[PDB]
């Protein structure tokens with residue numbers, strides 16, 4: 001499928017990887033999600049990534065996928081978990097913020113089996129009407145210095 005904008009929820013089990021992503025403009029995901037994001041990148045004008053650390057209760061910001069996975073990009077930057085991930089790709093964070101899932105009220109995702117937004121696994125796609133609004137709301141918040149600490 002070809003389209004203008006697509007939106008994916010990214011989960012991280014460690015805050016340090018979010019900090020590394022922000023400092024270096026890089027991400028990597030599971031091998032299966034890497035194929036999904038790669039297919040989206042080559043078929044979509046803009047692939048937006050909405051970042052939510054595990055057990056953080058919400059989103060820390062969003063960014064645009066800028067390149068395809070590349071084994072030569074920052075090899076091994078995540079440590080040994082690199083072995084369980086696809087290759088690294090460039091991401092440009094467009095906003096760092098704090099928005100809790102609870103602030104959005106009850107929201108479910110029709111592209112993810114009617115699961116609550118807060119129950120999204122890594123790589124979950126959201127429909128464009130919802131994804132666009134999530135990015136708009138994030139952009140309208142004050143920027144948060146996530147690297148504080």
Ligand SMILES: *O[C@H]1[C@@H](O)[C@H](n2cnc3c(NC)ncnc32)O[C@@H]1CO
Pocket residue numbers: 011012013014017027028029030054078085121122
């Ligand atoms: O639920 C997810 C998730 O939080 C985690 N995940 C996926 N991709 C990453 C990265 N990329 C650098 N860093 C930390 N955690 C990550 O994996 C589980 C699924 O096993």
